[PDB]
Amino acid sequence: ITGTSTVGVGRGVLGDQKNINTTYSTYYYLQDNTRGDGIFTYDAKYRTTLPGSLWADADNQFFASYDAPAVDAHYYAGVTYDYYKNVHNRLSYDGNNAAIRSSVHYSQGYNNAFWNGSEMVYGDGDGQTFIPLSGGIDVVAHELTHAVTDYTAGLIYQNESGAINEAISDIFGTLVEFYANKNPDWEIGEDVYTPGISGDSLRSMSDPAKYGDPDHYSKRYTGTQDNGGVHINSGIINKAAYLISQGGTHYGVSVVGIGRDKLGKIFYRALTQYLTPTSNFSQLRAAAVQSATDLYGSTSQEVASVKQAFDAVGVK
Ligand SMILES: Cc1ccc2c(c1)[C@H](CC(C)C)NC(=O)[C@H](CC(C)C)NP(=O)([O-])CCO2
Ligand SMILES: [Ca+2]
Numbered sequence: 001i002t003g004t005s006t007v008g009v010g011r012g013v014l015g016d017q018k019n020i021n022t023t024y025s026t027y028y029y030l031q032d033n034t035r036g037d038g039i040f041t042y043d044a045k046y047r048t049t050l051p052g053s054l055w056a057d058a059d060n061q062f063f064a065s066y067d068a069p070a071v072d073a074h075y076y077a078g079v080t081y082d083y084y085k086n087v088h089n090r091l092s093y094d095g096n097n098a099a100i101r102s103s104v105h106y107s108q109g110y111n112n113a114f115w116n117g118s119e120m121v122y123g124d125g126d127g128q129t130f131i132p133l134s135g136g137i138d139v140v141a142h143e144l145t146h147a148v149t150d151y152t153a154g155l156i157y158q159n160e161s162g163a164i165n166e167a168i169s170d171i172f173g174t175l176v177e178f179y180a181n182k183n184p185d186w187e188i189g190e191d192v193y194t195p196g197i198s199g200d201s202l203r204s205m206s207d208p209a210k211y212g213d214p215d216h217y218s219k220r221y222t223g224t225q226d227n228g229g230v231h232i233n234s235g236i237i238n239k240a241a242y243l244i245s246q247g248g249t250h251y252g253v254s255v256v257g258i259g260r261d262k263l264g265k266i267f268y269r270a271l272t273q274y275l276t277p278t279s280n281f282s283q284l285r286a287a288a289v290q291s292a293t294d295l296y297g298s299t300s301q302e303v304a305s306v307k308q309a310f311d312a313v314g315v316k
């Protein structure tokens with residue numbers, strides 16, 4: 001759409017009010033021209049055909065409940081774009097300011113979100129297992145990060161590489177949640193998962209085993225489900241990243257924390273400079289070590305913590 005940039009206001013899934021960037025041209029659309037080639041949010045109107053229709057509103061106020069998921073998808077995508085640009089100097093997912101598109105209200109009672117190779121898609125949840133998925137900033141950031149990974153390392157979606165791909169999305173979605181200082185934690189999806197139950201989440205990076213995911217290489221899943229357990233084994237890497245950041249003793253191995261910022265610098269460099277489509281856990285370790293070496297010196301504490309963390313999860 002061609003029109004005038006403006007700002008509207010609405011309420012998100014969690015009932016919070018926020019301003020969002022809109023474009024005016026007869027209607028007000030969810031099209032943000034202030035970021036790269038734009039952020040665009042579409043209505044899939046409970047169907048599965050994508051992308052659906054660019055979101056149009058008559059008055060620039062988005063307080064209807066059908067509006068909520070769009071508000072959040074639109075706003076959280078803008079925050080995530082900002083994180084990459086401000087923190088890593090990366091312009092959108094392809095590094096060349098590609099337009100970011102999302103569709104909401106996908107299907108009926110769909111309990112998931114995903115990147116389909118060209119855009120993000122969010123289900124509204126069935127209202128018991130989930131509420132509209134775009135209400136979780138860690139969820140939106142996990143989706144957009146899959147785009148980042150596809151454009152860079154290109155980790156294939158299966159076995160070890162696929163688990164690395166999933167951990168990357170969890171890690172950066174968690175860093176984005178902290179960046180936005182939105183009640184940050186090391187849990188994934190807490191904000192949209194099981195509305196009736198407090199305190200739970202889909203996955204835990206601080207203690208993956210809490211939900212049954214592995215937290216040590218000896219406990220990895222070797223079967224065929226989930227493409228070889230990409231959503232299961234990511235637990236081992238998630239645990240490693242949590243230790244590098246926060247520190248701790250795991251399975252008797254002690255790691256001194258180096259903090260989030262460095263965790264993000266080291267993983268972003270590994271991802272964009274050393275990882276390849278078929279990289280395995282052991283290769284991820286070499287990459288993280290080399291990245292930290294590059295950034296901080298081979299005899300740095302940083303390098304030391306990266307090594308300890310992987311040793312603690314059993315990855316040699
Ligand atoms: C077993 C499995 C297959 C495909 C999936 C997912 C799991 C998993 C289902 C969630 C846990 C309900 N999806 C994800 O972890 C993320 C969404 C969460 C961050 C809320 N979606 P993607 O990994 O991008 C797509 C595949 O989802
Ligand atoms: Ca309106």
Ligand SMILES: [Ca+2]
Nearest residue numbers: 182183184185
């Ligand atoms: Ca949180």
Ligand SMILES: [Ca+2]
Nearest residue numbers: 138187188189
């Ligand atoms: Ca979280």
Ligand SMILES: [Ca+2]
Nearest residue numbers: 193194195197
């Ligand atoms: Ca819950």
Ligand SMILES: [Zn+2]
Nearest residue numbers: 142146166169
């Ligand atoms: Zn994922």
